[PDB]
Design a protein around this ligand. Structure first.
Ligand SMILES: NC(=O)c1ccc[n+]([C@@H]2O[C@H](COP(=O)([O-])OP(=O)(O)OC[C@H]3O[C@@H](n4cnc5c(N)ncnc54)[C@H](O)[C@@H]3O)[C@@H](O)[C@H]2O)c1
Ligand SMILES: NC(=O)c1ccc[n+]([C@@H]2O[C@H](COP(=O)([O-])OP(=O)(O)OC[C@H]3O[C@@H](n4cnc5c(N)ncnc54)[C@H](O)[C@@H]3O)[C@@H](O)[C@H]2O)c1
Ligand SMILES: O=CNC1CCCCC1
Ligand SMILES: O=CNC1CCCCC1
Ligand SMILES: [Zn+2]
Ligand SMILES: [Zn+2]
Ligand SMILES: [Zn+2]
Ligand SMILES: [Zn+2]
Lengths: 374, 374
């Protein structure tokens, strides 16, 4: 019915930094070769989307943000072979072209066709499928899910299980996977280890889930907001500490608590200082610290290289290290199989039109993941 | 004959920073319980020794420096069980107590009994076995090899093969092991990979040798001293680049040359800037960069965390990651078996008394490793 035609629908447009989203009428062009048009069913509000608003994450404006979602294919452009109209799909903010050096590398996942390193805010072809008030609107990480309908490159979409609950599996599009893979694939948390997770929002709780799934014996949650402690304990945290409660730097407290340094630390906040702190708190000779949090654009951190010379390992990753097209479908299967839970991350559910409200809940500290339904 | 008695001998004393070594008479006390007195046979001049003279590496003065060496046990204190008078031995700058949490860890080697993190310049018991001009002289990393005789803790010495050539195997006490292990044990260089080695001195060439032994396909040597290239090529470098020859920053050059970034990079110099450069030159999604160089005391480097967030891995190690007491004896065995070469590192041989000359050759850029014989 709408196949091959321009669709007029509602989308949350971000016209300027530090402004509420503007729910308005947009024109979504029909999919070109190798492009898939998706009708959104659910989308979660991740801190990265708020980073676009606050200026922490730089991307061309105006833009239709949104990168954590699930929808149904409405139509496909010529040549698409991996999905079909009616399929349940999860847009992939980190593509998987499958032909570049990284996609071919056993451990790489940061596909070279990403729109993260030097954001263009367009489709793979350099153009936009969105128009608003007669003006072209930028895409965001090749996903733009804060719209009733979106247009993505074939390499930026994955077909998932037809019976998966879209209002829950959208978290596999970002939050959950990032968190879980960071612990289980990047850090490679080991059985009996001691972990330190800095930041207890949705990705941190998923980090905690991965550590617990890996057999960690101790999982110390760290947050300056004590209201996050309860849910952290529920998915696995054996202890939670609030840096504001101590008179000494949190890295000393954690070093003493772990009797010389943790085995694995994770920064899941987005601060230069906690990145350095999370590295210091890991054991000087064999500790491993993983940066997950996105810091303010263009800022450098300052650190003493002896932290690394003693033997520490410092690393980071996009989307928990997972090759997107291949793991998204498997993560959904595993979710379907009850291998991990998504419910503990979902604290509020709202209709898409209440997006600003959802951003207010995240900014106020009240929610973990608010899911927006269309 | 000298057992149980104070020995009077010559030693190179460092009385003040940035001053030539003072060849003078010293009194070396007899070894106490669990201590081993060694008659030095040969000692190499490593850049870390020069770091003590220049102030780059801080340690209590006055001191008897030297940590890369080999000698013969003269006598042992009560309770020693791992070595005997007459045994050939190699002093361990990084101890191996075998009882602490790091010693017990499968990947750790930075034993908690080390004198590197908070340098005391003494024996394990907090006292010195050296006297000079009536004053107590500090020990250096529990080794102090720039003396005809030294006293080391039992956990700081390894018994090696009785037929090994001490004027060559002293390099296994520092330079060679450090370099080689960095590539093969810490980076874990893979077959067919591309490597970038910054700094072509003794440790740099041994990093090259480990890359070549791991099967790397390309090994790019980087050095601002073109005279180092030849030797670098002789031990395995496939190409050598001098940053002064290009108009663009060396990390762009190396990223271009590797078509996107090397798999493995190594900083073997001791500069904050090169450390950051070597990390950048490694492929953004799966590159690994290892810091080997020792930078100036207490200085912080500045870096953008996005370098890690795309997927890079950044690490450092002391002594190429090797557990000292277990690996040194095996490393000698392998050298005896011709599994690796030491000759290429040795470019000058001098009698101990010409120590200052040996430091001059190092500082002038003329040598790689000068071996001092007693
Ligand atoms: N690398 C990736 O691929 C990826 C994927 C998703 C999100 N991220 C980044 O991960 C971070 C986490 O995202 P989220 O959605 O879970 O966000 P969030 O805002 O829900 O969680 C952050 C948590 O850190 C806490 N916090 C803030 N300041 C702190 C401080 N000074 N000390 C200790 N705790 C502090 C908060 O109270 C909050 O619970 C963000 O910065 C986001 O952009 C990265
Ligand atoms: N981590 C450890 O356990 C360990 C063990 C031994 C040595 N080290 C350190 O490793 C470093 C290497 O030691 P070495 O004995 O081989 O010393 P070295 O001085 O012989 O070698 C360093 C080399 O780097 C080159 N260089 C200098 N400035 C440069 C620049 N700006 N760019 C590129 N190349 C440059 C020199 O020309 C020189 O050939 C030292 O800093 C030493 O303290 C560490
Ligand atoms: O939120 C999804 N992805 C994040 C990944 C790191 C930079 C900002 C975007
Ligand atoms: O040279 C031998 N060891 C080095 C180890 C790193 C700190 C200074 C000394
Ligand atoms: Zn790719
Ligand atoms: Zn996200
Ligand atoms: Zn050395
Ligand atoms: Zn130990």
């Amino acid at each position: 019915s709408t196949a091959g035609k321009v669709i007029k629908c509602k989308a949350a447009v971000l016209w300027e930094e530090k402004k509420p989203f503007s729910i308005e009428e947009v024109e979504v062009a029909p999919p070109k070769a190798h492009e898939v048009r998706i009708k959104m069913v659910a989308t979660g509000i991740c801190r990265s989307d708020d980073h676009v608003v606050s200026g922490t994450l730089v991307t061309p404006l105006p833009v239709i943000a949104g990168h954590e979602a699930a929808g149904i294919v409405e139509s496909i452009g010529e040549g698409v072979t991996t999905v079909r109209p009616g399929d349940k799909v999860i847009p992939l903010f980190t593509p998987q072209c499958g032909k570049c050096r990284v996609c071919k590398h056993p451990e790489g996942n940061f596909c070279l066709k990403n729109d993260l390193s030097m954001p263009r805010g367009t489709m793979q072809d350099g153009t936009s499928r969105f128009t608003c008030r007669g003006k072209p609107i930028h895409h965001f990480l090749g996903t733009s899910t804060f719209s009733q309908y979106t247009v993505v490159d074939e390499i930026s979409v994955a077909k998932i299980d037809a019976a998966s609950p879209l209002e829950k599996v959208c978290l596999i599009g970002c939050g959950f996977s990032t968190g879980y893979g960071s612990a289980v694939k990047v850090a490679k948390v080991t059985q009996g280890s001691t972990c330190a997770v800095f930041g207890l929002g949705g990705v941190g709780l998923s980090v905690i889930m991965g550590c617990k799934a890996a057999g960690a014996a101790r999982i110390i949650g760290v947050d300056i907001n004590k209201d996050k402690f309860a849910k952290a304990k529920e998915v696995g945290a054996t202890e939670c500490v609030n840096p504001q409660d101590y008179k000494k730097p949190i890295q000393e407290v954690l070093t003493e608590m772990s009797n010389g340094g943790v085995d694995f630390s994770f920064e899941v906040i987005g601060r230069l200082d906690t990145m350095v702190t999370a590295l210091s708190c890991c054991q000087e000779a064999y500790g491993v610290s993983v940066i997950v949090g996105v810091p303010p654009d263009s800022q450098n951190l300052s650190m003493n290289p002896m932290l690394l010379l003693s033997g520490r390992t410092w690393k980071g990753a996009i989307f928990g290290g997972f090759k997107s097209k291949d793991s998204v479908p498997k993560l959904v299967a595993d979710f379907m199989a009850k291998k991990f839970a998504l419910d503990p991350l979902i604290t509020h559910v709202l209709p898409f039109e209440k997006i600003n409200e959802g951003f207010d809940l995240l900014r106020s500290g009240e929610s973990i993941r608010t899911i927006l339904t269309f």
